[PDB]
Amino acid sequence: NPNYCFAGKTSSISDLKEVPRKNITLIRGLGFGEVYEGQVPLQVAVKTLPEVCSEQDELDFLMEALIISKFNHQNIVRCIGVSLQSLPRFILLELMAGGDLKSFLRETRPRPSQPSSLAMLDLLHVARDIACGCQYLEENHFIHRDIAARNCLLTCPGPGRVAKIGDFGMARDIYRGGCAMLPVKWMPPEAFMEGIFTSKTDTWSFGVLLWEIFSLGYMPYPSKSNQEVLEFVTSGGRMDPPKNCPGPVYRIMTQCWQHQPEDRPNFAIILERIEYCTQDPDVINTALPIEY
Ligand SMILES: C[C@H]1Oc2nc(cnc2N)-c2c(nc3ccc(C#N)cn23)CN(C)C(=O)c2ccc(F)cc21
């Protein structure tokens, strides 16, 4: 059985908390492999491994389980346990009732019917939450490689919501595919060119996430294909501010997208800047666009 190392500690499949299959009930589907809402009463999301899979899919599934179980931070989704001794195999995650962040932003956009559905402070709180998770990964020398709204989750739809990093599939793949599947629109120049990844890789991606958040869920680089973005970014091109985006917030984005990784902020600095934005009345009193 494959070993996993995080923060200098080794873990094995033996370390995963096996939950007896009889204690687990599926309730409804949520969305390779399926995801279900479930009960163990503790409410969970259940990732399943198709019984029709390759041995590599099996190892991938096991590794995903090891990776998430070894994290310990409030802004990374918890693993309640696994059910690997019955088929189909389950990974049991903290149930994030708010769903993924991208879908949330698109669905919760202010509208004439829901004029005050979201405010700048809601977005800054989401940004801070994920930056805190990223800081934890950084200080533990784990490179996420795919920081993007689709990979973040919310505890609940409502005001007290907390955002967390919820998917680690890219990092799992790299720990051990094709060009058309790479998250090019979230990657820095040295990443897709030399295949060099460092903590500053995640800083660049966080910048793109920030744009996703303040655009309220738009796809980055509107109207641009992957190759067009690659050439755009490699030549110094950067996204414009999202609609109504406060200058101080856009400025964090543009610092995250510095060409030289040494010139980009670490997450401690990003968190400090997000904090200062949240204090600034001119930032948080800015109205988000109302989509007609
Ligand atoms: C593996 C899956 O984990 C989870 N999904 C939801 C909630 N909690 C999870 N631990 C979750 C998702 N959508 C909804 C809708 C309603 C409710 C409730 N109640 C929960 N969810 C997102 N999703 C389908 C996903 O696969 C998805 C997308 C991104 C990600 F990072 C993780 C996940």
Q: Name the residue type at position 50.
A: P
Closest CA to 89 of 109, 59, 114: 59
Please choose, from the candidates 153, 133, 278, 157, the residue with its C-alpha nearest in 3D space to the C-alpha of residue 205. Answer: 133
Cβ partners under 8 Å of residue 86, min gap 6: 21
Q: 């991208």: which residue's tokens?
A: 102
CATH of the domain spanning 96-280: 1.10.510.10
The technique is X-ray
- The residues after which the chain has a C–N gap greater than 2.5 Å are 31, 40, 176
CA distance linking residue 43 with residue 59, whole number of Å: 26
What is the rounded distance in angstroms from the CA atom of residue 77 to the CA atom of residue 163? Answer: 9
Dihedral angle, C-alpha 67, 73, 74, 80, nearest 10 °: 40
Strand-strand pairing, 4-6 and 9-11 = antiparallel
Task: Measure the N-to-C terminal CA separation of the chain; round to a whole number of Å.
Answer: 55
Tell me how far apart the alpha carbons of residues 103 and 151 are, in angstroms, rounded to a whole number.
11
CATH of 1-95, one of 3.30.1360.200, 3.30.2140.20, 3.40.50.11540, 3.30.200.20: 3.30.200.20
- Phi, psi angle pair for 93, to nearest 5°: -115, 155
- Please answer whether residues 218 and 278 qualify as being in contact, where contact means their C-beta atoms are separated by less than 8 angstroms: no
219 C-beta neighbours (distance < 10 Å), count: 12
Phi/psi of residue 46, nearest 5 degrees:
-115, 115
Task: Decide if 36 contacts 30 (C-beta within 8 A).
Answer: yes
The span from the CA of 140 to the CA of 137, in Å, is: 5
Please give the Cα distance from 157 to 142 (Å, whole number): 29
Atom 25, ligand 1: which residue's CA is nearest? 31
Distances, alpha carbon 239 to alpha carbons 3, 21, 65, 290, in Å: 41, 48, 36, 21
Q: Which residue has the least CA distance to atom 27 on ligand 1?
A: 100
The answer to whether 133 and 154 have CB atoms below 8 angstroms apart is no
92 lines ligand 1 (CB under 6 A): no
Q: What is the CA angle 175-177-181, rounded to 5?
A: 115
CA-closest candidate to residue 89, choices 34, 163, 142: 34
* Alpha-helix runs per DSSP H in the chain: 55-70, 101-107, 120-139, 169-175, 189-194, 199-214, 226-234, 247-256, 267-279, 281-284
Asked if residue 37 has its Cβ within 6 Å of ligand 1, the reply is yes
Q: Which residues are known catalytic residues?
A: 146
Instruction: Using the mean position of ligand 1's atoms as its centre, give its distance from the Cα of residue 238 in Å.
Output: 31
Binding residues for ATP: 47, 94-96, 167
Closest-CA residue, ligand 1 atom 16, reads 99
Residue among 49, 100, 107, 151 to mutate when testing ligand 1 (max atoms within 8 A of CB)? 100
Backbone angles phi, psi at 66, to 5 degrees: -65, -45
Domain positions in the chain are 1-95, 96-280
